[PDB]
């Protein structure tokens, strides 16, 4: 598994691969690991599949619940805190092997400068969190290859689309050097999933765009 997230001027993008394994055995060719938890935050989760999908679901429920009770969404700080508390709560089971790590991307509507209202937040197994400020983050078995790819490719990011292409490429290199991360399957037509958040909220990138970017990368490397 591998989930990358990077800020671009005016927004944030978050992409994730599709494979799920048991040991050396490829068990799922089309899992979706990036959820839209709310109109301004998307959440990726690496790790145990059960714990992951459960985290995502329950967190979305809690954000929206407070929103319905108080008539206003939490600030990005409150959201960060609740996610952190959930993660800290799973610590006992994470030592027993059921570890799940979330990467949280959001667009702060209350930030001062709109061009840098993008937000990326990373968590460890012990619930501590860190607001990333070098422009990108990743999680999962391929995270190191993905980060080392984005470090070089990141000067190319200038808008929503270039940022999307850089995301897809980083995923391609993760998969290229790690076997637990699936690359674009040209045969079955299964590509990474992506979410874009900007001033207007969060939308899923439609599959065709990711397909074209992936084919461009693959032809570039041949």
Partner 1 sequence: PYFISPEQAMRERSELARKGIARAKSVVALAYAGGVLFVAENPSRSLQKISELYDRVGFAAAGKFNEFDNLRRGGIQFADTRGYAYDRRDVTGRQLANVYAQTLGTIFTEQAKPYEVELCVAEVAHYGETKRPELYRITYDGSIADEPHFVVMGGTTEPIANALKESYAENASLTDALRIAVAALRALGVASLEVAVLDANRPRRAFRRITGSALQALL
Positions marked active-site: 1
- Residue 126 is a binding residue for partner 1 (CB under 8 A): no
- Which chain residues interact with a copy of itself by CB under 8 A? 28, 30, 48-50, 53, 88, 98, 126-128, 130, 133
Report yes or no: 149 and 2 within 8 Å, Cβ to Cβ. Answer: no
**CA distance to 25, 47, 122, 125, per residue, from 128 (Å):** 33, 17, 9, 8
Tell me whether residue 17 or residue 198 sits nearer to a copy of itself (CB atom): 17
DSSP for residue 170: H
The entry of a copy of itself, partner 1, none that residue 126 binds, CB within 5 to 8 Å by partner kind? a copy of itself
Of the residues 28, 29, 32, 77, which one makes contact with partner 1 according to CB under 8 A: 77
Q: Is residue 146 within 8 Å of 114, Cβ to Cβ?
A: no
Check binding of 128 to partner 1 (CB under 8 A).
no
Residue 99, φ and ψ in degrees, nearest 5: -80, 140
Task: Report the SS3 class of residue 81.
Answer: helix
CB of 49 to a copy of itself, least distance (A): 5
The span from the first CA to the last CA of the chain, in angstroms, equals 25
> From the list partner 1, a copy of itself, none, which binds 77 (C-beta under 5 to 8 Å, kind-based)?
partner 1
Query: Which among 139, 134, 74, 144 has a CA at the least distance from the CA of 106?
Result: 74
65 binds partner 1 (CB under 8 A): yes
Going along the chain, which residue ranges are E strands? 3-8, 11-16, 20-22, 25-28, 34-38, 41-47, 100-107, 118-123, 129-131, 136-139, 193-198, 201-204
The residue among 73 and 160 lying less far from partner 1, judged by its C-beta, is 73
User: What is the rounded distance in angstroms from the CA atom of residue 29 to the CA atom of residue 23?
Assistant: 15
Count of positions on this chain that bind partner 1 (CB under 8 A): 10
**Shortest Å, Cβ 78 to partner 1:** 5
The reply to whether 89 sits near partner 1 by the rule CB under 8 A is: no
68, interface contact from a copy of itself, partner 1, none, CB < 5-8 Å by kind: partner 1
- Distances from the Cα of 144 to the Cα of 3, 139, 197, 208, angstroms: 11, 8, 24, 28
**Residue 130 CB, nearest distance to a copy of itself (Å)?**
6
128 makes contact, choosing from partner 1, a copy of itself, none, with CB < 5 to 8 Å by partner type, with a copy of itself
Residues that bind partner 1 (CB under 8 A): 61, 65, 68-70, 74-75, 77-78, 81
């Amino acid at each position: 598994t591998t989930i990358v997230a990077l800020k671009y001027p005016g927004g944030v993008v978050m992409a994730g691969d599709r494979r799920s394994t048991q040991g050396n055995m490829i068990s799922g060719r089309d899992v979706r690991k990036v959820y839209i938890t709310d109109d301004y935050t998307a959440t990726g989760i690496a790790g145990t599949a059960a714990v992951a999908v459960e985290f995502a679901r329950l967190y979305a429920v809690e954000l929206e619940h407070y929103e319905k009770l108080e008539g206003v969404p939490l600030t990005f700080a409150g959201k960060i805190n609740r996610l952190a508390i959930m993660v800290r709560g799973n610590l006992a089971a994470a030592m027993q092997g059921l570890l799940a790590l979330p990467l949280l991307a959001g667009y702060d509507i209350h930030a001062s400068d709109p061009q840098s209202a993008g937000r990326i937040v990373s968590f460890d197994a012990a619930g501590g969190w860190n607001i990333e400020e070098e422009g990108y983050q990743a999680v999962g078995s391929g995270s190191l290859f993905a980060k080392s790819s984005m470090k070089k490719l990141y000067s190319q990011v200038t808008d929503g689309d270039s940022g999307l292409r850089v995301a897809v490429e980083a995923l391609y290199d993760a998969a290229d050097d790690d076997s637990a991360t699936g690359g674009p399957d040209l045969v079955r037509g299964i590509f990474p999933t992506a979410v874009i958040i900007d001033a207007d909220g969060a939308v899923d990138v439609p599959e065709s765009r990711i397909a074209e970017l992936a084919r461009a990368i693959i032809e570039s490397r041949s």
